[PDB]
Amino acid sequence: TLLRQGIRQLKEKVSKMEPEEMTVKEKKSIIEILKARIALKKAFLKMALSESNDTVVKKEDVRESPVDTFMENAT
């Protein structure tokens, strides 16, 4: 959510080789502070990631195969 594109919006905000960047980054870090708590909202972990999710989708891919078998026998 906000953690995603918030990085995208903070990312372009860097400007000038001069150390004025902090004046921008102070606006960033506060959001990041919120992110530190926004991340708390997302303190969950069901599935790991890939490839386990891919294994799930493939698991249905075999599990959807019978549907074109016995159901065909129904017809």
């Binding site: 195969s65 065909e72 026998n73 129904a74």
Partner: protein
Amino acid sequence: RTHNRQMTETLEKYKSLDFNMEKEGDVIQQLKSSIKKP
């Protein structure tokens, strides 16, 4: 009288060809009707 036609049709329904297995013929065909599918 109730059991009759009901048993017949239910054989003809999802079972359709209940003889389709043909005993041993229903062995590898169970893959041919399924594992062969792609």
